[PDB]
């Protein structure tokens, strides 16, 4: 429909039926809507380096589609079940190359036979975005189990979230531990717990996830923040508060990085340095995913139902709600970019 304007800020969010909506961040209104092919699930999207193509893991975690936002055209399609007799699923595990020429996806395949199933080892499959609607693996490597979120750093390296965070070479497939989680033998603490299905493309250009950890049942529950700088590969972890409630997603304000905002049943504002809660706000309902605009003047709350809550991050109060056409956003992740 209407092509996106240059210099203008936009936000993409996927909605239940099978829509991808473009939100004009300036007016807080729906700019346009695109109907997506096949079926929804998870509907997780990420913008390509061209600020024009959105890549979406859809069709029940078994396919990846490229949609051109200016025209709503399906320009790319990769099915994750190219190996005969196997069904491949991706647990939110896909990433776009810095130049936007390849798409990576780790596939947990299952061989389905006549009277039984056989779970096979996972594998990373590389697809060339130039291959269109019938893209097939141009390269494949072995992957460890329990791999989920992945983000391609600027130097082409692939940061893979699994039992540990790995740094992977997409040409050789060799990887090393970039940040130990399960094997983080930190004395006085337990191993961290990480549950994250939201690959935020935040203004800070970092791969961040929240985690919880017990500091020695008497063990003290803490919330932490982990981050991988996608420019320099620099990693960082740090607890920012004693756990009194749960948060699904959390982001640092691009305006003030010392402030981290987490969300679920309440929207909390924390002081990283002081490890202190500065303010919490009650929500109209549960929200899963936070999203900050470029300057950090607005805080969007998505996921769950069909409405985006718009908050003033300073006052921590809901300014308005953007009602999206259709239904539930479910586990979708709101993505902000400048066209």
């Amino acid at each position: 429909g209407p092509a996106l304007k240059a210099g203008h800020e936009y936000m993409i969010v996927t909605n239940y039926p099978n829509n991808l909506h473009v939100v004009d961040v300036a007016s807080d209104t729906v700019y346009k809507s695109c109907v997506m092919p096949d079926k929804f699930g998870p509907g997780t999207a990420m913008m390509a380096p061209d600020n024009r193509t959105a890549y979406v893991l859809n069709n029940h975690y078994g396919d990846i589609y490229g949609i051109d936002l200016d025209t709503c055209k399906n320009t790319f399609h990769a099915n994750l079940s190219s190996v005969p007799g196997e069904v491949g699923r991706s647990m939110y595990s896909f990433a776009i190359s810095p130049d936007g020429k390849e798409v990576y996806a780790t596939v947990n395949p299952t061989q389905r036979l006549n009277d039984h199933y056989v779970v096979k080892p996972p594998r990373l499959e590389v697809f060339s975005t130039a291959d269109g609607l019938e893209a097939k693996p141009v390269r494949t490597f072995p992957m460890p189990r329990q791999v989920y979120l992945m983000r391609a750093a600027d130097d082409g390296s692939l940061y893979v979230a699994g039992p540990d965070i790995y740094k992977m070479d997409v040409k050789t497939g060799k990887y090393t531990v970039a940040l130990p989680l399960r094997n983080w033998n930190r004395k006085g603490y337990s191993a961290p717990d990480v549950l994250y299905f939201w690959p935020h493309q935040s203004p800070r250009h970092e791969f961040s996830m929240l985690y919880t950890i017990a500091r020695f049942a008497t063990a003290d529950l803490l919330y932490g923040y982990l981050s991988v700088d996608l420019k320099t590969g620099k990693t960082h972890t740090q607890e920012f508060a004693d756990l009194t409630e749960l948060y699904f997603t959390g982001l640092r304000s691009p305006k003030d990085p010392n402030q981290i905002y987490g969300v679920l049943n309440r929207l909390a504002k924390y002081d990283l340095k002081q490890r202190k809660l500065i303010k919490a706000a009650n929500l109209d309902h549960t929200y899963y995913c936070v999203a900050f605009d470029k300057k950090g003047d607005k805080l969007y709350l998505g996921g769950t139902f069909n409405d985006l809550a718009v908050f003033n991050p300073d006052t921590l109060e809901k300014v308005k709600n953007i009602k999206l056409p259709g239904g539930d956003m479910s586990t979708t992740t709101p993505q902000v970019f400048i066209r």
Partner: protein, 77 residues
């Protein structure tokens, strides 16, 4: 824990990790498809990733169409 509730608390379904119902989703419908899409609680909530793919067909908007959600076991008759 009770035999006919789940013990996988992420934050849960019957009971949250804290042993109550507050850390749960509010309302439950807000976390329904988050639970259903990836088959997080397959024994209680029907899986749309694999088994019951069109479970929410008449209830895309769970806040207003939660009544259209049916039970899945193929009972006699």
């Amino acid at each position: 824990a009770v035999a006919g509730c789940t013990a996988t608390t992420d934050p849960g379904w019957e009971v949250d990790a804290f042993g109550g119902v507050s850390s749960l989703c509010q309302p439950m419908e807000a976390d329904l498809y988050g639970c259903s899409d990836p088959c997080w609680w397959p024994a209680q909530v029907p899986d749309m990733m694999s088994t019951y793919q069109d479970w929410n067909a008449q209830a895309s908007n769970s806040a207003e169409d939660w009544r259209n959600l049916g039970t899945v076991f193929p009972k006699d008759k």
